[PDB]
Chain A
Amino acid sequence: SKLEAILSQEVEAEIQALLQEAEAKAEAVKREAEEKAKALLQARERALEAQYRAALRRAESA
């Protein structure tokens, strides 16, 4: 009915805004995890490059 349409539409739009809040929360969870992952990858690559430079210096000394 008409009042069914009113109640359903209004508080279902409230539930939809709640779902948008939940999706924004999940995106904020994923963003910092991606940041930590890429920072770990970059630090690993930096440590590897320092290791290879030390290996080249050892080969030069030999």
Chain B
Amino acid sequence: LWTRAQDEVARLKALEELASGRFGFALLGYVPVKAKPKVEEALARHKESV
């Protein structure tokens, strides 16, 4: 549960690094080029492949 708590605190404290108003958000990040298929298949899960 310490690992779980560190995961939750890390996710919520990184959640404030976004930008939004009222009908949507946007965020920016940096990905090394040998990580593109993993992020692409991970973000292929979401709503209409946002």
Contact = CB atoms under 8 A, between A and B. Distances in A.
B50 A7 contact: no
Interface string A1-25: 0110011100100000000000000
B48 A7 contact: no
A59 B25 CA distance: 84
The secondary structure that dominates the B interface is loop
Which interface class (under 10, 10 to 19, 20 to 34, 35 or more) fits A? under 10
A3 B49 CA distance: 9
B45 to A, nearest CB: 15
A4 to B, nearest CB: 9
A6 B24 CA distance: 10
Interface of A: 2-3, 6-8, 11
11 contacts: A2-B48, A3-B24, A3-B48, A3-B50, A6-B47, A6-B48, A6-B50, A7-B23, A7-B24, A8-B23, A11-B23
